[PDB]
Amino acid sequence: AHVQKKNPLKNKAVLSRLNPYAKAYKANVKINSEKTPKAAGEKFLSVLHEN
Amino acid sequence: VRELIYKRGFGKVNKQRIPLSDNAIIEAALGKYSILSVEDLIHEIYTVGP
Amino acid sequence: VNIIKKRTKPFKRHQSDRFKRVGESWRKPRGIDSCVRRRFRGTISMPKIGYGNNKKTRYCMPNGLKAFLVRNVSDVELLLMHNKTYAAEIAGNVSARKRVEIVEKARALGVKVTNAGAKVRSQE
Amino acid sequence: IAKRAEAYEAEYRAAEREQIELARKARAEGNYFVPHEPKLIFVVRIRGIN
RNA sequence: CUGCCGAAGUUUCCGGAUAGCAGAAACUCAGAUCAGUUUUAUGUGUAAAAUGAGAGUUUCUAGUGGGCCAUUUUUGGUAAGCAGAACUGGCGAUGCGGGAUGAACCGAACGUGAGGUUAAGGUGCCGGAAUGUACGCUCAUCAGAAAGGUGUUAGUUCAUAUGAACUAGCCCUGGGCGCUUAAGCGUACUACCCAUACCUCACCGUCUGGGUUAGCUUUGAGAAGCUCAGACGAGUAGGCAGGCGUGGAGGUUUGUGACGAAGCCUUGGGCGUGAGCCUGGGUCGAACAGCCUCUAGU
RNA sequence: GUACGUGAAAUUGCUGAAAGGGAAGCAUUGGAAAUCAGUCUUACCUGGGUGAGAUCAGUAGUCUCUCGAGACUAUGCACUCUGAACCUGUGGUAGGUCAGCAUCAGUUUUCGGGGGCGGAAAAAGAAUAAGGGAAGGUGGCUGUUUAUAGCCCUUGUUGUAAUACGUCCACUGGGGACUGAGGACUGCGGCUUGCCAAGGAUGCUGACAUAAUGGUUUUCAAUGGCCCGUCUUGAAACACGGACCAAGGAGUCUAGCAUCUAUGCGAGUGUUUGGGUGAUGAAAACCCAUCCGCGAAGGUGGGAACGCCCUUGUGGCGUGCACCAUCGA
């Protein structure tokens, strides 16, 4: 049993053996283009652009 | 944390360096701690569980 | 499982080339300050268990057969069922008379003879 | 195991989102937020046995 | 001949008995204790959390029972160095890469191999690797790898664009070939070179943990067998184990031999990590051998 | 061929070979010359014909065993069989070495593409309506303030700009090298019983073989390597011993003691002083009389092993070895 060591990352079939989730990931997600609320304190900028 | 356990994560089964290439190995040793697969092993390590 | 050897060259004794009273048979140098025993660069090697060959290939001739020494024609008969792994080596003192009896019997048996052409001569 | 993987990924992504949102708010109203101290490090030996 | 384990190198009393280290056996426990460990806290010690490892006994028996170097610690020193005690490591039992070479310096500690990448150190040539990029400094007419200077470099400060006093660097004075806005120095960032080291695999062995019989047509019961898994591999003194070889002895091969024994030589072919072995050819001419045990002027 | 069995090494002479700038020497890697290793399509299967034989006869006898199992002797060659011999096939498949590509797997090194989230939600910048300002000053005239160049700063400014940086992708597309350990079947997964990149390499081909791949020898080329043993010394330095070859050559034999293990017997144990005996070496073996030697002179708990269970497991209830604690004697 386990004659060879097959890399879960390199081999997609061993990944399915270890990761019964890799079938459904969709890692990339659009969490932008929704009127991005530029967040920066004005006094934070004042102390940033000092000295 | 994920990549080290996948590519280089070897168990300690009967004081032997047994590779973790199947989910049955972890649960045979860590079944008592509700760890039953590699994802749980990562979660027990990354989140530092009990 | 092919016949692969970890080393070809023999292990000669240290300083065995310089002297003639010193035999080429490997003798472990026990000299207290012996740098060649101390494994320095430019020295010779030394037999180690790390040099052993594959256990499924030890005693195997380069063609895959293991030599088996047959004295008489009785011995060549028992290689009936290992002809694919053993080769009937004919002993050095077996006379040319029984030497043909061994080769003709072994040819029909199907086994391989290693020194089948010694002391004999063919005639057509 | 598959469902436990769902919860773990959701927990990880929520934790990252919370930390990013925590810093954005502090930067927005000017207060300074210190992130929580990590509990896990990975040690690598670099010097031999001599 | 190979394989495994492998110190001590010295306390302490006193030539020794101890001890210690290493083993070898017998025990009892891992739900029990520990640690050249670290914390917590009570008053640096002590006591009670983490990190790891199973831990503790009794018996009997080899070897050692020096030092050198380095670190440090001090005391005095004493021309000056230094000396004197200690302190702790390394070598010593230990090879390899680097340091031009060089036992003490920088790396790294060793089965046989294939690939990969590195450490220290290096990339002008010898020399494997950029005559890399950016920025300065160095001019030596001995470079380079206490001071002075009509010596510079950058300058600072103070005086009124010029001087003085200064700040500091460097030069001058007091491994080879070569290198000179370097192939020198100094900083930074890329890229590359390579170790007996690190990774992945193969193989040999060692130890450890298994599996295996109403021996199931997977046949793999020399159970002293076959099979599976993992880690490991320096070595003196020394301890343990398995083997190879010589003469002869009882058994055996219904063994070999004038169609050529034993021996001998030979750049013939093989086998074994090795001690050793088997064989071809040439000489040779009367004996000899494999196996299980016995034995020694081995 | 009487310098007479075999005729080794040192050592010397001749010849052939290569090599030969103050050594040689060996080790790795090859090359070259010289030389050996080993070569094999051939057999298998199938088809028919031809003659056969026999372990076959809708067959007959003997022999040794235990009905039938062998060895045979007649007789026929069918019924099968002998892939049996030949003709018939010109049918079908073709044993090692070495290179080639492919689809894969493990270990990798190297170029890419596409994207997510994060950072002053980069900063910038362009774009962008102004104002102000000074400049190293355009125009006007060194001084000057947008002109007959404009710039900078400040807002304003599109916006959620984009880039970069940092990080992730169970996103993807190529290049190259080194490995094939294992040998039915399991397992674990995915696709959909089957199939697969999932418990380790298999295909397509060629050439060589009737030489290639190989090995050995001398030599050369590049990299290397201070004489061995002893003793000394941390270490060396050393000082010793070594002209070369062959043969000889050094923990042995014995009594005593203790230890460990193996064997036989076991409150026993030991024939070999001696006697009996031994026809085939008879100094062996085999047998035992009288001594003699050496031995011989209770409770408590922890415990190995086992049983009963019984909420089982957990544990309890026990029985308790060796032994250790305890009280004991």
Short mmCIF file of N, CA and C (backbone and C1' of nucleotides) in Angstrom, two decimals, chain F residues 149-206:
data_model
loop_
_atom_site.label_atom_id
_atom_site.label_comp_id
_atom_site.label_asym_id
_atom_site.label_seq_id
_atom_site.Cartn_x
_atom_site.Cartn_y
_atom_site.Cartn_z
P A F 149 2.77 82.29 -27.48
"O5'" A F 149 4.04 82.11 -26.54
"C5'" A F 149 3.90 81.61 -25.21
"C4'" A F 149 4.76 80.40 -24.97
"C3'" A F 149 4.10 79.26 -24.21
"O3'" A F 149 3.32 78.44 -25.06
"C1'" A F 149 6.22 79.71 -23.27
P G F 150 2.33 77.34 -24.42
"O5'" G F 150 1.95 77.95 -23.00
"C5'" G F 150 1.75 77.10 -21.88
"C4'" G F 150 2.98 77.03 -21.02
"C3'" G F 150 2.83 76.30 -19.70
"O3'" G F 150 2.91 74.89 -19.83
"C1'" G F 150 3.94 78.35 -19.35
P C F 151 2.17 73.94 -18.77
"O5'" C F 151 3.12 73.99 -17.49
"C5'" C F 151 4.48 73.60 -17.57
"C4'" C F 151 5.25 74.06 -16.37
"C3'" C F 151 4.70 73.61 -15.02
"O3'" C F 151 5.06 72.28 -14.70
"C1'" C F 151 5.24 75.91 -14.93
P C F 152 4.03 71.35 -13.88
"O5'" C F 152 4.15 71.89 -12.39
"C5'" C F 152 5.40 71.92 -11.73
"C4'" C F 152 5.36 72.78 -10.50
"C3'" C F 152 4.23 72.47 -9.52
"O3'" C F 152 4.53 71.37 -8.68
"C1'" C F 152 4.36 74.81 -9.88
P C F 153 3.35 70.40 -8.18
"O5'" C F 153 2.60 71.25 -7.07
"C5'" C F 153 3.28 71.68 -5.90
"C4'" C F 153 2.48 72.70 -5.13
"C3'" C F 153 1.04 72.33 -4.84
"O3'" C F 153 0.89 71.45 -3.75
"C1'" C F 153 1.13 74.54 -5.66
P U F 154 -0.27 70.34 -3.76
"O5'" U F 154 -1.58 71.17 -3.41
"C5'" U F 154 -1.68 71.91 -2.21
"C4'" U F 154 -2.82 72.89 -2.25
"C3'" U F 154 -4.17 72.31 -2.64
"O3'" U F 154 -4.83 71.67 -1.56
"C1'" U F 154 -3.78 74.25 -3.90
P U F 155 -5.14 70.10 -1.62
"O5'" U F 155 -6.25 69.97 -2.74
"C5'" U F 155 -7.62 69.78 -2.40
"C4'" U F 155 -8.46 70.96 -2.82
"C3'" U F 155 -9.59 70.65 -3.79
"O3'" U F 155 -10.74 70.13 -3.15
"C1'" U F 155 -8.40 72.56 -4.53
P G F 156 -11.34 68.71 -3.60
"O5'" G F 156 -11.98 69.00 -5.03
"C5'" G F 156 -13.03 69.93 -5.18
"C4'" G F 156 -13.05 70.52 -6.57
"C3'" G F 156 -13.20 69.52 -7.71
"O3'" G F 156 -14.54 69.16 -7.96
"C1'" G F 156 -11.39 70.97 -8.18
P U F 157 -14.95 67.61 -8.13
"O5'" U F 157 -14.04 67.10 -9.33
"C5'" U F 157 -14.19 67.62 -10.64
"C4'" U F 157 -13.14 67.08 -11.56
"C3'" U F 157 -12.96 65.57 -11.51
"O3'" U F 157 -13.90 64.87 -12.29
"C1'" U F 157 -10.85 66.60 -11.32
P U F 158 -15.16 64.17 -11.57
"O5'" U F 158 -15.55 62.98 -12.56
"C5'" U F 158 -15.69 63.22 -13.96
"C4'" U F 158 -15.03 62.13 -14.77
"C3'" U F 158 -15.26 60.70 -14.26
"O3'" U F 158 -15.40 59.80 -15.36
"C1'" U F 158 -12.95 61.14 -14.38
P G F 159 -16.27 58.46 -15.19
"O5'" G F 159 -15.56 57.66 -14.01
"C5'" G F 159 -16.16 57.58 -12.72
"C4'" G F 159 -15.41 56.67 -11.78
"C3'" G F 159 -15.43 57.09 -10.30
"O3'" G F 159 -15.51 55.93 -9.48
"C1'" G F 159 -13.21 56.84 -11.01
P U F 160 -16.12 56.01 -8.00
"O5'" U F 160 -15.38 54.84 -7.22
"C5'" U F 160 -13.96 54.81 -7.11
"C4'" U F 160 -13.39 53.55 -7.72
"C3'" U F 160 -12.95 53.67 -9.17
"O3'" U F 160 -11.82 52.83 -9.40
"C1'" U F 160 -14.62 52.02 -8.99
P A F 161 -10.36 53.48 -9.62
"O5'" A F 161 -10.07 53.26 -11.17
"C5'" A F 161 -11.07 53.50 -12.15
"C4'" A F 161 -10.45 53.83 -13.48
"C3'" A F 161 -9.26 52.97 -13.87
"O3'" A F 161 -9.63 51.74 -14.45
"C1'" A F 161 -8.72 55.25 -14.16
P A F 162 -9.19 50.35 -13.76
"O5'" A F 162 -7.73 50.09 -14.34
"C5'" A F 162 -7.49 50.14 -15.74
"C4'" A F 162 -6.12 50.69 -16.03
"C3'" A F 162 -4.96 49.95 -15.38
"O3'" A F 162 -4.57 48.80 -16.10
"C1'" A F 162 -4.72 52.26 -14.98
P U F 163 -3.92 47.55 -15.32
"O5'" U F 163 -2.43 48.02 -15.02
"C5'" U F 163 -1.57 48.42 -16.07
"C4'" U F 163 -0.39 49.19 -15.54
"C3'" U F 163 0.48 48.46 -14.54
"O3'" U F 163 1.41 47.59 -15.16
"C1'" U F 163 0.00 50.61 -13.72
P A F 164 1.80 46.19 -14.46
"O5'" A F 164 2.60 46.63 -13.16
"C5'" A F 164 3.81 47.35 -13.27
"C4'" A F 164 4.25 47.92 -11.94
"C3'" A F 164 4.42 46.92 -10.81
"O3'" A F 164 5.65 46.22 -10.89
"C1'" A F 164 3.24 48.80 -10.03
P C F 165 5.74 44.69 -10.41
"O5'" C F 165 5.66 44.78 -8.83
"C5'" C F 165 6.59 45.57 -8.10
"C4'" C F 165 6.09 45.85 -6.70
"C3'" C F 165 5.65 44.64 -5.90
"O3'" C F 165 6.73 43.90 -5.37
"C1'" C F 165 4.05 46.35 -5.67
P G F 166 6.75 42.31 -5.50
"O5'" G F 166 5.80 41.82 -4.32
"C5'" G F 166 6.03 42.26 -2.99
"C4'" G F 166 4.81 42.10 -2.13
"C3'" G F 166 4.10 40.76 -2.21
"O3'" G F 166 4.75 39.74 -1.47
"C1'" G F 166 2.51 42.49 -2.30
P U F 167 4.85 38.26 -2.08
"O5'" U F 167 3.37 37.69 -1.95
"C5'" U F 167 2.81 37.44 -0.67
"C4'" U F 167 1.33 37.14 -0.76
"C3'" U F 167 0.92 35.97 -1.63
"O3'" U F 167 1.10 34.71 -1.01
"C1'" U F 167 -0.47 37.81 -2.10
P C F 168 1.22 33.39 -1.90
"O5'" C F 168 -0.27 33.09 -2.37
"C5'" C F 168 -1.27 32.73 -1.44
"C4'" C F 168 -2.64 32.69 -2.07
"C3'" C F 168 -2.82 31.73 -3.23
"O3'" C F 168 -3.01 30.39 -2.84
"C1'" C F 168 -3.73 33.81 -3.81
P C F 169 -2.56 29.20 -3.82
"O5'" C F 169 -3.64 29.24 -4.99
"C5'" C F 169 -4.98 28.85 -4.75
"C4'" C F 169 -5.84 29.05 -5.97
"C3'" C F 169 -5.41 28.33 -7.23
"O3'" C F 169 -5.78 26.96 -7.25
"C1'" C F 169 -5.94 30.56 -7.75
P A F 170 -4.73 25.84 -7.71
"O5'" A F 170 -5.57 24.49 -7.68
"C5'" A F 170 -6.52 24.19 -8.69
"C4'" A F 170 -7.71 23.45 -8.12
"C3'" A F 170 -8.87 24.31 -7.64
"O3'" A F 170 -9.73 24.71 -8.69
"C1'" A F 170 -8.34 22.73 -5.98
P C F 171 -9.55 26.15 -9.38
"O5'" C F 171 -8.52 25.89 -10.56
"C5'" C F 171 -7.53 26.85 -10.88
"C4'" C F 171 -7.69 27.36 -12.28
"C3'" C F 171 -6.83 26.67 -13.33
"O3'" C F 171 -7.40 25.47 -13.80
"C1'" C F 171 -6.61 29.01 -13.55
P U F 172 -6.45 24.25 -14.24
"O5'" U F 172 -5.83 24.73 -15.63
"C5'" U F 172 -6.67 24.98 -16.75
"C4'" U F 172 -5.97 25.82 -17.79
"C3'" U F 172 -4.71 25.21 -18.40
"O3'" U F 172 -4.99 24.28 -19.43
"C1'" U F 172 -4.26 27.43 -17.75
P G F 173 -3.88 23.20 -19.85
"O5'" G F 173 -2.92 24.00 -20.83
"C5'" G F 173 -3.43 24.63 -21.99
"C4'" G F 173 -2.35 25.43 -22.68
"C3'" G F 173 -1.06 24.69 -22.96
"O3'" G F 173 -1.13 23.90 -24.14
"C1'" G F 173 -0.57 26.78 -21.98
P G F 174 -0.27 22.55 -24.25
"O5'" G F 174 1.10 22.93 -23.56
"C5'" G F 174 2.31 22.30 -23.94
"C4'" G F 174 3.31 23.30 -24.47
"C3'" G F 174 4.76 22.91 -24.30
"O3'" G F 174 5.21 21.97 -25.26
"C1'" G F 174 4.50 25.10 -23.54
P G F 175 6.07 20.71 -24.76
"O5'" G F 175 7.54 21.30 -24.63
"C5'" G F 175 8.04 22.18 -25.63
"C4'" G F 175 9.38 22.73 -25.23
"C3'" G F 175 10.35 21.73 -24.63
"O3'" G F 175 10.96 20.89 -25.59
"C1'" G F 175 10.34 23.68 -23.32
P G F 176 11.15 19.33 -25.26
"O5'" G F 176 12.30 19.34 -24.17
"C5'" G F 176 13.57 19.89 -24.47
"C4'" G F 176 14.50 19.83 -23.30
"C3'" G F 176 14.58 18.50 -22.58
"O3'" G F 176 15.39 17.55 -23.24
"C1'" G F 176 14.36 20.20 -21.00
P A F 177 15.17 15.99 -22.96
"O5'" A F 177 15.93 15.75 -21.59
"C5'" A F 177 17.29 16.12 -21.46
"C4'" A F 177 17.70 16.20 -20.01
"C3'" A F 177 17.60 14.90 -19.24
"O3'" A F 177 18.68 14.02 -19.49
"C1'" A F 177 16.67 16.65 -17.96
P C F 178 18.40 12.45 -19.66
"O5'" C F 178 18.29 11.94 -18.16
"C5'" C F 178 19.35 12.19 -17.25
"C4'" C F 178 18.94 11.81 -15.86
"C3'" C F 178 18.26 10.46 -15.72
"O3'" C F 178 19.15 9.36 -15.76
"C1'" C F 178 17.04 12.06 -14.52
P U F 179 18.56 7.89 -15.97
"O5'" U F 179 18.02 7.53 -14.52
"C5'" U F 179 17.20 6.40 -14.31
"C4'" U F 179 16.23 6.63 -13.18
"C3'" U F 179 15.04 5.70 -13.16
"O3'" U F 179 15.36 4.46 -12.56
"C1'" U F 179 14.29 7.90 -12.91
P G F 180 15.49 3.15 -13.47
"O5'" G F 180 14.01 2.59 -13.48
"C5'" G F 180 13.25 2.57 -12.28
"C4'" G F 180 11.90 1.95 -12.50
"C3'" G F 180 11.90 0.82 -13.52
"O3'" G F 180 11.20 -0.32 -13.03
"C1'" G F 180 10.40 2.57 -14.20
P A F 181 12.07 -1.47 -12.32
"O5'" A F 181 12.81 -0.67 -11.15
"C5'" A F 181 13.64 -1.32 -10.20
"C4'" A F 181 13.14 -1.04 -8.80
"C3'" A F 181 11.95 -1.88 -8.37
"O3'" A F 181 12.35 -3.12 -7.83
"C1'" A F 181 11.49 0.39 -7.98
P G F 182 11.95 -4.49 -8.55
"O5'" G F 182 10.41 -4.65 -8.20
"C5'" G F 182 9.99 -4.69 -6.85
"C4'" G F 182 8.50 -4.50 -6.75
"C3'" G F 182 7.65 -5.52 -7.49
"O3'" G F 182 7.44 -6.69 -6.73
"C1'" G F 182 6.88 -3.32 -7.94
P G F 183 7.92 -8.12 -7.28
"O5'" G F 183 6.70 -8.62 -8.17
"C5'" G F 183 5.38 -8.73 -7.63
"C4'" G F 183 4.33 -8.63 -8.71
"C3'" G F 183 4.26 -9.80 -9.67
"O3'" G F 183 2.90 -9.97 -10.09
"C1'" G F 183 4.78 -7.84 -10.88
P A F 184 1.86 -10.73 -9.14
"O5'" A F 184 0.55 -10.82 -10.03
"C5'" A F 184 0.21 -9.75 -10.90
"C4'" A F 184 -1.10 -10.01 -11.59
"C3'" A F 184 -2.32 -9.33 -11.00
"O3'" A F 184 -2.46 -7.98 -11.40
"C1'" A F 184 -2.80 -11.60 -11.39
P C F 185 -3.01 -6.89 -10.35
"O5'" C F 185 -4.37 -7.52 -9.82
"C5'" C F 185 -5.54 -7.53 -10.63
"C4'" C F 185 -6.69 -8.14 -9.87
"C3'" C F 185 -7.01 -7.50 -8.53
"O3'" C F 185 -7.78 -6.32 -8.65
"C1'" C F 185 -6.95 -9.84 -8.29
P U F 186 -7.06 -4.91 -8.90
"O5'" U F 186 -8.00 -3.88 -8.15
"C5'" U F 186 -7.91 -3.72 -6.74
"C4'" U F 186 -8.83 -4.66 -6.01
"C3'" U F 186 -9.21 -4.20 -4.61
"O3'" U F 186 -10.56 -4.58 -4.32
"C1'" U F 186 -8.12 -6.29 -4.48
P G F 187 -11.60 -3.45 -3.84
"O5'" G F 187 -10.70 -2.40 -3.05
"C5'" G F 187 -10.39 -2.60 -1.68
"C4'" G F 187 -9.37 -1.61 -1.18
"C3'" G F 187 -9.74 -0.15 -1.31
"O3'" G F 187 -10.63 0.28 -0.30
"C1'" G F 187 -7.51 -0.47 -2.01
P C F 188 -11.99 1.03 -0.69
"O5'" C F 188 -11.55 2.55 -0.85
"C5'" C F 188 -10.68 3.15 0.10
"C4'" C F 188 -9.90 4.28 -0.51
"C3'" C F 188 -10.72 5.24 -1.35
"O3'" C F 188 -11.43 6.19 -0.57
"C1'" C F 188 -8.77 4.65 -2.53
P G F 189 -12.86 6.70 -1.08
"O5'" G F 189 -12.50 7.91 -2.04
"C5'" G F 189 -13.20 8.08 -3.26
"C4'" G F 189 -12.33 8.74 -4.29
"C3'" G F 189 -13.01 9.11 -5.59
"O3'" G F 189 -13.76 10.31 -5.50
"C1'" G F 189 -10.97 8.04 -6.06
P G F 190 -15.29 10.32 -5.97
"O5'" G F 190 -15.20 10.73 -7.50
"C5'" G F 190 -14.51 11.91 -7.89
"C4'" G F 190 -14.03 11.83 -9.32
"C3'" G F 190 -15.08 11.50 -10.36
"O3'" G F 190 -15.88 12.61 -10.72
"C1'" G F 190 -13.16 10.20 -10.74
P C F 191 -17.40 12.38 -11.18
"O5'" C F 191 -17.27 11.77 -12.65
"C5'" C F 191 -16.70 12.54 -13.70
"C4'" C F 191 -16.44 11.69 -14.92
"C3'" C F 191 -17.65 10.99 -15.52
"O3'" C F 191 -18.45 11.84 -16.32
"C1'" C F 191 -15.86 9.47 -15.36
P U F 192 -20.05 11.71 -16.28
"O5'" U F 192 -20.33 10.18 -16.63
"C5'" U F 192 -20.11 9.68 -17.95
"C4'" U F 192 -19.93 8.18 -17.95
"C3'" U F 192 -21.20 7.37 -18.21
"O3'" U F 192 -20.87 6.19 -18.95
"C1'" U F 192 -20.29 6.77 -16.12
P U F 193 -18.75 -2.35 -11.08
"O5'" U F 193 -19.80 -2.25 -12.28
"C5'" U F 193 -20.73 -3.30 -12.52
"C4'" U F 193 -21.01 -3.47 -13.99
"C3'" U F 193 -19.82 -3.37 -14.93
"O3'" U F 193 -19.06 -4.56 -14.97
"C1'" U F 193 -21.63 -2.13 -15.81
P G F 194 -17.51 -4.52 -15.39
"O5'" G F 194 -17.54 -4.29 -16.97
"C5'" G F 194 -16.37 -3.90 -17.66
"C4'" G F 194 -16.63 -2.71 -18.56
"C3'" G F 194 -15.49 -1.72 -18.68
"O3'" G F 194 -14.51 -2.13 -19.62
"C1'" G F 194 -17.49 -0.55 -18.26
P C F 195 -12.95 -1.99 -19.26
"O5'" C F 195 -12.68 -0.43 -19.34
"C5'" C F 195 -12.82 0.28 -20.56
"C4'" C F 195 -12.81 1.77 -20.35
"C3'" C F 195 -11.60 2.33 -19.62
"O3'" C F 195 -10.47 2.49 -20.45
"C1'" C F 195 -13.57 3.25 -18.69
P C F 196 -9.00 2.29 -19.83
"O5'" C F 196 -8.75 3.62 -18.99
"C5'" C F 196 -8.68 4.88 -19.63
"C4'" C F 196 -8.56 5.99 -18.63
"C3'" C F 196 -7.44 5.87 -17.62
"O3'" C F 196 -6.17 6.23 -18.12
"C1'" C F 196 -9.43 6.46 -16.51
P A F 197 -4.92 5.25 -17.90
"O5'" A F 197 -3.92 6.08 -17.00
"C5'" A F 197 -4.34 6.63 -15.76
"C4'" A F 197 -3.38 7.67 -15.25
"C3'" A F 197 -3.87 8.46 -14.04
"O3'" A F 197 -2.75 8.80 -13.22
"C1'" A F 197 -3.41 9.94 -15.80
P A F 198 -2.22 7.78 -12.10
"O5'" A F 198 -3.47 7.58 -11.14
"C5'" A F 198 -3.74 8.51 -10.11
"C4'" A F 198 -4.71 7.95 -9.11
"C3'" A F 198 -4.36 6.56 -8.59
"O3'" A F 198 -3.43 6.61 -7.53
"C1'" A F 198 -6.61 6.60 -9.28
P G F 199 -2.87 5.26 -6.86
"O5'" G F 199 -2.60 4.28 -8.08
"C5'" G F 199 -2.51 2.88 -7.89
"C4'" G F 199 -1.74 2.53 -6.64
"C3'" G F 199 -0.86 1.30 -6.70
"O3'" G F 199 0.36 1.53 -7.37
"C1'" G F 199 -2.03 1.35 -4.65
P G F 200 0.79 0.62 -8.61
"O5'" G F 200 2.06 1.38 -9.16
"C5'" G F 200 2.23 2.76 -8.89
"C4'" G F 200 3.46 3.31 -9.55
"C3'" G F 200 3.89 2.61 -10.84
"O3'" G F 200 4.41 3.58 -11.74
"C1'" G F 200 5.66 2.56 -9.29
P A F 201 3.77 3.74 -13.21
"O5'" A F 201 5.02 3.55 -14.18
"C5'" A F 201 5.57 2.26 -14.41
"C4'" A F 201 5.02 1.66 -15.68
"C3'" A F 201 5.71 0.38 -16.14
"O3'" A F 201 4.76 -0.40 -16.86
"C1'" A F 201 5.94 2.02 -17.79
P U F 202 4.85 -2.00 -16.84
"O5'" U F 202 4.19 -2.44 -18.21
"C5'" U F 202 4.71 -1.99 -19.45
"C4'" U F 202 3.68 -1.17 -20.20
"C3'" U F 202 3.72 -1.27 -21.71
"O3'" U F 202 3.10 -2.44 -22.21
"C1'" U F 202 3.56 0.99 -21.08
P G F 203 3.44 -2.94 -23.70
"O5'" G F 203 2.51 -2.05 -24.64
"C5'" G F 203 2.69 -2.04 -26.04
"C4'" G F 203 2.20 -0.75 -26.65
"C3'" G F 203 2.79 -0.41 -28.02
"O3'" G F 203 2.12 -1.06 -29.08
"C1'" G F 203 2.94 1.47 -26.60
P C F 204 2.93 -2.03 -30.07
"O5'" C F 204 3.27 -1.10 -31.31
"C5'" C F 204 2.29 -0.22 -31.84
"C4'" C F 204 2.93 1.03 -32.39
"C3'" C F 204 4.04 0.82 -33.40
"O3'" C F 204 3.56 0.54 -34.70
"C1'" C F 204 4.73 2.41 -31.80
P U F 205 3.97 -0.83 -35.42
"O5'" U F 205 5.51 -1.00 -35.04
"C5'" U F 205 6.51 -0.92 -36.04
"C4'" U F 205 7.32 0.35 -35.92
"C3'" U F 205 8.74 0.26 -36.43
"O3'" U F 205 8.82 0.41 -37.83
"C1'" U F 205 8.72 1.31 -34.31
P G F 206 9.01 -0.88 -38.77
"O5'" G F 206 10.47 -0.70 -39.37
"C5'" G F 206 11.60 -1.19 -38.68
"C4'" G F 206 12.58 -0.10 -38.35
"C3'" G F 206 14.03 -0.52 -38.33
"O3'" G F 206 14.61 -0.55 -39.62
"C1'" G F 206 13.56 0.64 -36.36
#
